[PDB]
């Protein structure tokens, strides 16, 4: 898999490929690895599918309950909850998660919880097998407070490369855009992104 | 934790006439990927203690949280939290060494090596080490990881014994430590140019310095190294 | 796979004089080929005129010493501040050790003090708590280098009276604390020369009817 | 399983003033089982003495072999081999077997007949010259020998004092080794003569 | 073991500790680890000590012979090539790790060689268990265009790092200095900081102390 | 292992050697002779791994026979034993080692002494007044140490042996089906008619 | 290690060596391998030192409680069975012990039970245990008579250990001797095997091969 | 969960639930035992309030505990069965661990101790 | 393993059980009884791992004794054997399994028949005219298959057994130190006072 | 290590980092991994140092001899010879080599021989541990027929990133420029390239 989240001026965007493999067989070529845990808090999943689905399912539950009781939770709070599950169960999980969300006090925020359950807040984050191929490209091209249209491009290009090189990544590129405005899903197909 | 994932390298430290100094680079590595650059591994506790941590970062972050909460609990029903009954280094250390030995003894270690540096309310320097096995010791110098191998040798040239601690100023101690960081930068493949350094002085108190860089490096000579044996150009 | 043990050793030595006892150890603490400390003491006074050392894996040794002292303190509360006789301390320590028979304390333990007649006494334990009153015993890294020497110079083992051809065994004497201390320092300078884990410093605790007294000597630092 | 610890045994050699001494236990074992008390581990080729601890089949073989070579040497150089040279010989002969070696710990002692110097040396099982004026040790109680020796030895002992020292060093070490003992022999070597003594010791 | 090599402006110097160990036991307190390959090319070894002796003797010999054939002073790069090709052949089973330095007619040289047969060239080098202590010192003090007397001081300090801080090393410091003009200078025990104190006692025995069963005179003749 | 004993009295050497041969679960035979005569006054008994024991003995035998014919002379027992040791010592560093242990009892006509040699499969040789291979020593050495005198007659030797075999029958888990006993003396080699 | 015990007309003899070993290194030449459970009952130490010493001391505590409750000396049957039962509860955990439990009660007479960490418990008249075991058995098997004088029984026990100390590398140091009667056990001293060896050789003729 | 304290002290120092228990005994059929030079005999009465009694199957009043010890009782019959089962088990267990049958004293001491425990534990009468 | 045999003749059942107990290298004892009487007419012999065998037997014994006292009645041999089989069948899936094999010979007073039951450590039970545990069957079944008649007298049974023990002495590598033999008949259980 | 070679209009440039590690210890911080096998044929070494030095030493030998006899060899011929050593000895080599050279007929040529000894001719090539991080960046920034200064920058930036991210890469950046003009060595130090 290849996944990333990027903060920009108006909020934050998450993107991902859409391939799931069991060895070389592509089990699913249209996976949704962008997963909602609250209206405006989403995550990117990598690692085991069972593990990351089951975790995301639980976080969503916790935040539904948080909300019922204390109102809307901070992106940070959501990252705390993921981390607590991942840290406390490191011995039998294989999950690498990027959390991202938007509120008005803080605009976009991105937290990454790699294996082991450490948590790291960042301007952007990349992950999944495909990510190794684009550390160079991303460090070279990310700038803070990009526009939306710039940031969709930065993601589209980063992931087009991750895909090109990583056999465990491919398919369509999905994004989810998080701003004061609301929630926009995007999709880009092979004929667009291969050609870049 | 049964096997460390994101990791911090050497912490180094020494004590000088009036306090202690301690330092550590700002890197979290992921095997040989140098992944996270903005990582503070010096953790100040009150105004008389800095805890420096290496090894697994998820565990470090757990230990941070225990330290926050020790500070919070010591304040409870404690009119003298900011005075005679604040936390000493010696207390924070005993607590950590307890926890480590306990976690080891349940075969589920905190995969770290820690150095607690501070100045005791009675003026005394404190410098002790504990790690994932619960092993502890003190010395005028202390370092984890590579630092044990390269930094101690250099810092011991300054304080070879107890009797030298009074003689060692904070300018000398600090310059020694900075030089060590440069040496480790040269030779530890898991290290970073950027680091943090902290001083705990029984008169100036806690000075914490973020964002240092190794400077005054020598590489020029590298231009005359050609081949590996017999090549001349 | 996590290995919960290590080796910091460490050499310790305990000798029973006839109205006194000594217990000594280097002060150097190591890991692999590194020194961690050139002064990290490993012989402790635990009160009731009892000195203890637990050499081996330093964490397990520290835990054990802690626990024992706490045992002393609770003996007091529980038995009307009674003094803890060295033989009772030994039994008590067998119980602590054997308590961890299936995840042992990885240490060789020695204690020293006076039996109930004011005679010198030394007890030595294995890691799971078998134990023995003993007149002298070395422990840890360089024990194999020292016991033969003591067999010879304390017990006059293999020594005979010139001139009879080994028909009359050389007779034993009582050794002044000063004499015993020479043999201690000589054992340790020998060991330091020939064992890489021994050096730096020598600390000796001496137990007499009049209490506990400490004595320290530089050792070579390579 | 360890070939250097099946049969057991020790050898030690030290120097005095215008003399050298060399000594061994006498035990041939086979693990726990004592087998012989008349397994001398000290041989000589002219005025050069060789102690060999380790796997006994190899002790024997090496002796048979150095007897053979020092024989051929005498026949051609028309003179007995000296210790400095023998040492090199031992060393090169072991390193021929670098990747399949003899499981032994040799020790050389002798006095050079030209120069008059006391000389001693030892080696690992593949033949690195551990060269030392004071003393050398080898065997299953090499640790205990290092300890006795470092305490007992002082330089320039007269022959009759050196005897007393090396004897004590050997006996008290063998007594702390399960796999050595069962008797002991000591050679004292002076330039023109050599005396060999059997020691009284415990038998358990 | 700690061994180092430092170039200076007119040549090169190497140094070494003098301890050698079998496990945690010290078998020799004053072992000389500085080996000659030819008069102006010297060598220091770490690793298996039978392998470093064997392989310096062997190459020393092939060098001498090759020198006699060619009627030319032997070159370091020849020692280097011959060493490495042999180590490589044996796939690392010959446990020799060396710092070789010397002067030949092409100038002064400093190389290291690893057991598997890789080689490094440099201005300063260390190897052995004491390697990292020594390198910390070199990384701290080396400058370009050292005088000879600075290079010795530096190399000597580097080895001291190993002696004190490493348990694998050492006792004394040996040095060899190879200057372009001159005979190579070999300073056995250039430095001896580690003398045993007088013991508290003498352990000389009263004669007749030992029990005996037999005397024989032995036949040398 | 099987049972291999030997004892050197004053005028001869007595070899006692178990009769059983067992292959796993069955005892295949109860009357097997674990000796070969090497020359008229030299006897070798042996035990160890199947096939190897016999092949080795019969090879030693033929070599000594060859020597005798060639030189019209009988090698001393000492020489035979050195020859045998050297062969075993070659075996150990060979591609497939002979796993065989032997005792050599001989009467040395030139010195008019009996001699016993013990040699294990490594080539470890030693001259002894009494010996054994494998576990056989463990039961019997106590008794020999006690009772043995160098001036024993053959009859005394055979009594001392009877006692050793009784101790073995009592304390040893295996039924070795008795022993065959031979005597090597100045007049050669004969077999004791019955060890009842 | 070598340990033995046997029954005769005069009660029980118990005899043991005193050597402790860690690999080749001889840790001690002075280990008490007889545990004095109480003044009427003896145990021997083989296998684990701690395991024997700890549990046999504990056995002493249990036997005492039995006597306070029942107002009657505990039988050796019952004493042995308490220890085997405990030991069996730990089977598989890696206890290591092989011991003889020795006593002499009015109701049973002199009795010996062998107990080990396998669970095994066995009544018999002669046992030896340890790396020196096979050596000891030889001597005992060829001399033991039911009606040995006590003085000769003590000698036989001492000579059987000596046999083992001599051949077995893992046995030696000194011998310890005990005589167990209905009124309890009597210690019969500690004998250095160094001095004892030579004495026996000379006095008895034996150990011919050793040069003395 | 039910640990209500039922056998407790009243202010005169008595424990009514235990005294009330004796009342049950006083109502039970008479039993008697007498000892000889070397027999002991146990005799007990039957009720005659009902006489279509199957006498071969109906529980006897004397019970074997081991082959050498018997026990008889007065009072609640259902309650007697529980003491007897416990005693029979103790006897077999005693053989097992000490390799001897119980003394009579021991077995009595055991049963009494059970009875006593039930006067001092919550939830039981 | 040790030797555990049994045979059911016309009016009784005969159990033959080896006397040796050996611990590693030494034979510790040559007079051990590998039986327990479970009730006056029911006998159980046993073999398998050390400690386990006795502990198991003495536990079965005490249970049957408890039953007899409670009901003043002796369980039939069939019932005892079903009880024992069930206990072994629990052991097998337990944390540490009893490794014990048994034979149960009883005389059933109610039907006036002898009965023999063979049960291995897994709880595999079977009623047979003759049986054995471990390798013992391998040597002896040939002979029993041939000679056995259901109408044999006790004397005939003991002859047939004598022959079996001879075959075991001849062909079996281990010295099991003879057997103890017991007979279970209408009058109970007695031991044949000598056998070889 | 991180290494590359890049063809440009006037010829070809090779670059590399200068770090050699044994685990985490940096054995040598000023390594020369650019190695000459002929005047204008060079290579980049990655994998085992012993293996790549030893191979390079042999290739150089073969081409010295080629030259003596047939004149100057083609860059393709040099790649053939590396390949033949690497393919034929794949079972005991760990060597990943880029070969590059210049002649007038062909200007710059780059061949890469990864593990296994397959050979591949390319416009540019990257390799060593550090290469994984810059597949994206290089695919995105390389164009054919760059100028020398452009190409020195493309390399400098690609390797600055590989170094940044890979712990097994670092030190100075060396290059070697190959054109009609001759042979230029370049060096760039940390204070230059970290700052890009
Ligand atoms: Mg992952
Ligand atoms: Mg957080
Ligand atoms: Mg979960
Ligand atoms: Mg995992
Ligand atoms: Mg760590
Ligand atoms: Mg608190
Ligand atoms: Mg706690
Ligand atoms: Mg420079
Ligand atoms: Mg360990
Ligand atoms: Mg307790
Ligand atoms: Mg110093
Ligand atoms: Mg030859
Ligand atoms: Mg000639
Ligand atoms: Mg070879
Ligand atoms: Mg040397
Ligand atoms: Mg050979
Ligand atoms: Mg071999
Ligand atoms: Mg339990
Ligand atoms: Mg054995
Ligand atoms: Mg029961
Ligand atoms: Mg209740
Ligand atoms: Mg059936
Ligand atoms: Mg069998
Ligand atoms: Mg590679
Ligand atoms: Mg090749
Ligand atoms: Mg690489």
UniProtKB/Swiss-Prot annotation, chains A, J:
The active site is at 1 (nucleophile). GO terms for molecular function: endopeptidase activity; threonine-type endopeptidase activity. It comes from the Eukaryota. InterPro entries: Ntn_hydrolases_N, Pept_T1A_subB, Proteasome_bsu_CS, Proteasome_sua/b, Proteasome_suB-type. GO terms for cellular component: cytosol; nucleus; proteasome complex; proteasome core complex, beta-subunit complex; proteasome storage granule. SUPFAM superfamilies: N-terminal nucleophile aminohydrolases (Ntn hydrolases). It is found in: Cytoplasm; Nucleus. Its EC number is 3.4.25.1. It catalyses: Cleavage of peptide bonds with very broad specificity. GO terms for biological process: proteasomal ubiquitin-independent protein catabolic process; proteasome-mediated ubiquitin-dependent protein catabolic process. Keywords: Acetylation, Cytoplasm, Hydrolase, Nucleus, Protease, Proteasome, Threonine protease, Zymogen. It is an enzyme of class 3 (hydrolase). It holds the Pfam family Proteasome. The proteasome degrades poly-ubiquitinated proteins in the cytoplasm and in the nucleus. It is essential for the regulated turnover of proteins and for the removal of misfolded proteins. The proteasome is a multicatalytic proteinase complex that is characterized by its ability to cleave peptides with Arg, Phe, Tyr, Leu, and Glu adjacent to the leaving group at neutral or slightly basic pH. It has an ATP-dependent proteolytic activity. PRE3 and PRE4 are necessary for the peptidyl-glutamyl-peptide-hydrolyzing activity. Belongs to the peptidase T1B family. This is Proteasome subunit beta type-1.
UniProtKB/Swiss-Prot annotation, chain C:
One of its GO terms (cellular component) is proteasome complex. Transmembrane segments: none annotated. Pfam families: Proteasome. Its main location: cytoplasm. One of its GO terms (biological process) is proteasome-mediated ubiquitin-dependent protein catabolic process. Keywords: Cytoplasm, Nucleus, Proteasome. Signal peptide: none annotated. It comes from the Eukaryota. It is found in: Cytoplasm; Nucleus. The keyword Iron does not apply. The 26S proteasome consists of a 20S proteasome core and two 19S regulatory subunits. The 20S proteasome core is composed of 28 subunits that are arranged in four stacked rings, resulting in a barrel-shaped structure. The two end rings are each formed by seven alpha subunits, and the two central rings are each formed by seven beta subunits. The catalytic chamber with the active sites is on the inside of the barrel. Belongs to the peptidase T1B family. This is Proteasome subunit beta type-6.
Swiss-Prot record, chains F, I:
This is Proteasome subunit beta type-4. The modification Phosphoserine is found at residue 76. SUPFAM superfamilies: N-terminal nucleophile aminohydrolases (Ntn hydrolases). One of its GO terms (biological process) is proteasomal ubiquitin-independent protein catabolic process. It comes from Saccharomyces cerevisiae (strain ATCC 204508 / S288c). Pfam families: Proteasome. Present with 21800 molecules/cell in log phase SD medium. InterPro entries: Ntn_hydrolases_N, Proteasome_beta2, Proteasome_bsu_CS, Proteasome_sua/b, Proteasome_suB-type. It is found in: Cytoplasm; Nucleus.
Swiss-Prot record, chain G:
It is an enzyme of class 3 (hydrolase). One of its GO terms (biological process) is proteasome-mediated ubiquitin-dependent protein catabolic process. Keywords: Cytoplasm, Hydrolase, Nucleus, Protease, Proteasome, Threonine protease, Zymogen. Changing residue 51 to N: In DOA3-1; decrease in activity. One of its GO terms (molecular function) is endopeptidase activity. GO terms for cellular component: cytosol; nucleus; peroxisome; proteasome complex; proteasome core complex, beta-subunit complex. Bortezomib binds at residue 49. It catalyses: Cleavage of peptide bonds with very broad specificity. Its EC number is 3.4.25.1. The active site is at residue 1. Its main location: cytoplasm. It is found in: Cytoplasm; Nucleus. The proteasome degrades poly-ubiquitinated proteins in the cytoplasm and in the nucleus. It is essential for the regulated turnover of proteins and for the removal of misfolded proteins. The proteasome is a multicatalytic proteinase complex that is characterized by its ability to cleave peptides with Arg, Phe, Tyr, Leu, and Glu adjacent to the leaving group at neutral or slightly basic pH. It has an ATP-dependent proteolytic activity. This unit is responsible of the chymotrypsin-like activity of the proteasome and is one of the principal target of the proteasome inhibitor bortezomib. Belongs to the peptidase T1B family. The side chain of Thr-1 acts as a nucleophile, and the N-terminal amino group acts as a proton acceptor. Present with 8530 molecules/cell in log phase SD medium. This is Proteasome subunit beta type-5. The gene is PRE2. The chain holds residues 76 to 287 of 287 of the full protein.
